[PDB]
Ligand SMILES: [Ca+2]
């Protein structure tokens with residue numbers, strides 16, 4: 082019925098869209114990136130459709146950066162077998178992500194392909210550190226899954 | 241004045257206290273682990289004292305597991321140079337952590353040594369998956385830093 086499940090997780094902040102290392106705190110006037118995962122339950126009755134991430138600023142003054150360019154302002158990677166297999170994260174084709182909304186205070190991304198049971202998506206989002214704490218709410222949903230699934234991640238910004 | 245800063249991040253869920261791989265969703269009747277980082281600002285005016293993590297269940301029915309045994313129910317690791325140097329995470333001595341509280345609905349850990357500017361602590365916490373979504377609030381504080389710093393992590397539990 083429900084018979085499909087999804088999960089969301091925060092991975093915290095990084096100083097690069099992909100690779101690099103962790104950050105937080107962040108000095109005002111520097112870029113940083115939030116990373117979030119959406120994970121399809123390995124037991125799901127088939128692939129999931131319209132897998133959507135909605136991120137919104139709830140506290141503080143940092144802003145999502147740029148105009149919404151894939152490979153600079155955001156990245157979406159697929160781990161095709163999730164934690165259950167040795168395949169790694171690789172960026173999807175530009176064709177496979179729709180920017181529903183890109184603004185300094187809110188970003189919405191939808192994955193157009195269907196998401197295999199067990200597979201995971203990694204979303205990286207560029208932000209402008211502006212002083213104090215920034216917190217964002219991340220919501221994950223799909224058509225088939227009883228969403229939303231919600232986390233809050235928080236970044237300390239040095240004035 | 242303030243002149244010291246701290247940060248907190250969620251790292252999401254894992255199927256092992258250390259190492260292993262990521263999980264979430266989690267099937268009811270299985271163990272899983274939350275990981276959280278507390279990070280000292282590299283610019284802090286000296287080391288920080290009484291670095292404390294307070295984690296509380298806000299939604300759902302999963303519980304922190306066991307009686308509070310270091311190396312089974314929780315782990316605390318130090319990365320002595322944080323992301324700024326090549327030293328890795330290593331578990332601290334049992335003497336260096338006080339269990340302020342350990343209950344199925346709330347856990348409190350304090351790091352007794354002082355935390356060098358730039359250094360980070362990684363806290364892993366065992367939980368019992370019980371069906372629906374579980375969310376925990378994690379608060380980080382120190383004596384010198386304008387805390388608390390708060391995140392929320394959420395786990396989907398399969399009935
Ligand atoms: Ca999660």
Ligand SMILES: [Ca+2]
Nearest residue numbers: 163166167168
């Ligand atoms: Ca994989």
Ligand SMILES: [Ca+2]
Nearest residue numbers: 105235248249
């Ligand atoms: Ca953070």
Ligand SMILES: [Ca+2]
Nearest residue numbers: 322325326327
């Ligand atoms: Ca290090």
